[PDB]
Structures are given as structure tokens and as C-alpha cells.
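> tool_call: predict_assembly(chains=two)
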Amino acid sequence: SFLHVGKMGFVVTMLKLIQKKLLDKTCDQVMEFSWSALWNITDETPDNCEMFLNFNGMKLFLDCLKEFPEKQELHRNMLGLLGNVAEVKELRPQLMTSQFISVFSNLLESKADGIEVSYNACGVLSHIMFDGPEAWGVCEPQREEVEERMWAAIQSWDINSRRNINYRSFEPILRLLPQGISPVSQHWATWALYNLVSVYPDKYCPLLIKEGGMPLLRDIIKMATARQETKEMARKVIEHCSNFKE
Amino acid sequence: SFLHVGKMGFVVTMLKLIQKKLLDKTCDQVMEFSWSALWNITDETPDNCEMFLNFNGMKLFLDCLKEFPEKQELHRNMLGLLGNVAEVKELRPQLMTSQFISVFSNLLESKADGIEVSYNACGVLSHIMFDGPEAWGVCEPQREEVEERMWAAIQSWDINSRRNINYRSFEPILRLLPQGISPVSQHWATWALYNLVSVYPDKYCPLLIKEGGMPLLRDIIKMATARQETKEMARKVIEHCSNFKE
């Protein structure tokens, strides 16, 4: 259990603490815990994502990135949080600024904490791209050059990477499978499932099966808009999950 | 997404800071933050509960309770943390001393932050009772005395109490439903569900339904040996979750 985050104003409490550490130019255990807490309490919790945005959280995220460019665990926590914010469709338009898209695109090349910072940057952009080209506006970088960077990011990750992430539900990722708007978003979501069932099949094969990932992955194989590399990947997820279903 | 991992260096930073504020005899914003941080990172996270105990957590809890006997927010954070610790079967042996059981049973009548201190003291004791009488040994007060203080406390709580608590999973509470060792533990768990679906059905009716609470509550009603008081509370939970459903 935990306290009542809304009644306690707990998101604000963490952002006020982050602001104080940033001005003290200190990224210590307390700074990093504050971001880990926001990451955890935004998990499938849109009102907390919304409080983060409305308390000027993005500025704090960007100022911490600049002030602590090499603090890898700090970046992992900040990006876990942003991955949760990006799952809220009603909030994603606030992410569509040149300043923000620039940061996410650049983090696709992050080697911080293995692949976690690049992975969540890619997931943020995967949900953004899922809204389609109208949503992108005149943002520089070009939607195509970011999409190009996403394919490169995904393909650079060790498929057997051990992970510093967990999911109570695959629902937000599965969102990106039955869609032709954004093949790259579909490819990121397919890699995400493939990585987890390869390394952690005991935990994630049954979650994927129960939540209906099997037909969805079959549909990708017959989907004109799906890329060959996505179709072959989904075949291998289905295969891992079948060696488990016995 | 989330990450519920042990954080040995942070558990230790929080405890060493609590020790410092103890000796300074100031229960300030930092004192209360440290206990709330421990509450947060022990949520569904047994590893942090284990390091809490290994690094002298229980004595710091006891001392803080003695030093600051009227700091109700402190008590609420402290008992939220201890409620999380007590969920860990492997760790409950470290709680079986007369000193601790007397402390916890003497919090059953606490009026601090509504019912939260009373509720969490009862939860700690419910998991302890679930372990059976052999686990109690020679601890004082006697198990039967604490059991009656437990029924009394539960009955004293406003069934529609507003709450300063949050659960992301009901797993540890559901643990207490299909069991015949401790009726008072079963009753505590049923109340915990009943209050939450009664005050916040939109959050907790779907969670209870999703994690399989309905067959468990139905089983209690069908259990020839179950207490009718508990049967009827279980039935009201089923009723409200059915009223929630369409």
C-alpha cells in the first residue's frame, strides 16, 4: 500500500523536492528516488501524469537532463515516467513541441542504463507516432528523420537484454499492434513483447496470452501495412509463447 | 510501466536520516518524508522490507513512536510502512516479540489520521494471526486478548470512512480470505475490501473483479464454518461489485 497520492499532493511534493535538488545541483539518492516515485505512481494513472505536466514537470525533466547529463539511473527514472505520460492520449499533444520531440529523438541514441532510456524514448515516440501525421505539425526534426532514428534504435538493442522495467498489463503496448497508422510504433511494441518473452517467459508469456496478444500477433503476419521484419518478429513471439503453452 | 526493486543504499539513507532526526528530536518535513519514502518503496516490494528490518528499522520505529507520541502524520507513514513489511511471510518472525505485539495491539484504538493508524495496526496483526498460534509462542499480551481488540477496532471504524490509502493490487488482502486459521484476519480483509468498494467503487470494484476476488468472497458465504458477520460483509462487497457492473 501507499498513501493517497491525490489527497496528499504527493506528485507536487516530489517535484518540489526535485526542484530543490536541481538548484543544489545534487543528484543523490533522494533526487533519484523522487523520479522513481513519479515513475511508479504514474503507472496506468493518468491523473498523476496530468498533475506532473500541470506542475511544470517537463521543465524539471529537461533541466535535470542538462544539469546531470551522465547520471544514468536518473535518466532511466525520468524516462520511465515519461513513458507513462505518453500512454495518455489526451496529454500527448503537450509533448508535440520542437523542444520535446528533439529531446526524445536524441535519447534514442542513449546508452544509459543499458537500453532503458533509449527504449522508453522510443515508446514515447511510438505512442506519439500512433496519432498520425496530422498530429506532428511543423516540428523539427522531421517526422521521417525521427522515425528513421526509431528503426535504428530498435534494431541496435540486444534482443536478450536484461531489463529494468516491468508491466502489470501489456494493454498500452498491445494498443500499437492492430494499427496501420504507424508501422514503426507497431515494430517497437512487437520488439517490446519479444524481448520480455525471450528473457522472462515465466512472467510474461502468460500475461501476453491472457490479454489476447496471440491473435493480434497473427493478424500482424497477415497485415499489408506491417513490415517484413515485424511479421517475422511476431512469428517468433508466437513461437516462444507456444513452447510455453505446453 | 513500473519498477519495484530493492534499493539497499536508499533504505539505508532514509534510516540513517531518521536516526539523525530522532537525536535532533525534530519531527520535521524531512523526518516525515523519510518515513513516507519507505512506505512508497515497500509497496509491493518485499526486498525493501527485508533491508528495512536488517538495518535496525524496528528500533527506529519504536523510538520514533516514543519520542513523538502525538505526531499523527508520522504515525500514519510509519504504520503504512509496517503494514507493507508485515505482508512478507518470511519477515513476520522478526515481529514476534512481546514488545512489538504490545505496541501494535495498543495502536488498535488509535485516532490518528482518521482510521489509518488503527487500520494498519490491525492489518499487521491480521497477517501475524494468519500464521497461527505456534508463531505467537509466549508473546504478551495473549493472542486471544489481541484478537478481541481487533474485532472491536474493526467494528469501530466508519464503514464509509474516507481513506488516506491506496492499493495497486489486492493480492496481500485476498491472501486472508480463503483461510480458516484466523477468522479475525478474514474479517479484517473483508472490511478492507468493503470500505474501498463502498467509498471508491470506480477504482476498486474493477481491481477486485480483475484479481479474482469474487469467487473468494462467494466461497466465504458458502463456507459452513465462516462467521455470519463476515459472510454478510462479503455479500455486500459482491452486491456492490455487481451494482458497479452495468
